[PDB]
Design a protein around this ligand. Structure first.
Ligand SMILES: [K+]
Ligand SMILES: [K+]
Lengths: 48, 59
């Protein structure tokens, strides 16, 4: 379960292939990679 | 640094996520944390969809 804000950002780092998990990344960068990743997943989904 | 400028841009990212994620109501304000929660569930769904169900080999 996602109980706090940091748990949410950390989860997103795991889920999004393009977000590095072994160097520092900003919250802002996380949001942008998440956005791009969603756009990619949606076009793939739409193909079906 | 321009603290508020970066915050407005983060805020823009949050608003975009509101558009992208179906489960999120757009004609209503939603907290940043709830937005990330909807985002996480939605990405998980899309992954399961694309990784398993949408495969020809899916049983
Ligand atoms: K990752
Ligand atoms: K929406």
């Amino acid at each position: 379960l996602l109980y706090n804000m940091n748990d949410c950002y950390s989860k997103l780092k795991e889920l999004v292939p393009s977000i590095p998990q072994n160097k520092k990344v900003s919250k802002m960068e996380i949001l942008q990679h998440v956005i791009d990743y969603i756009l990619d997943l949606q076009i793939a989904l739409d193909s079906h």
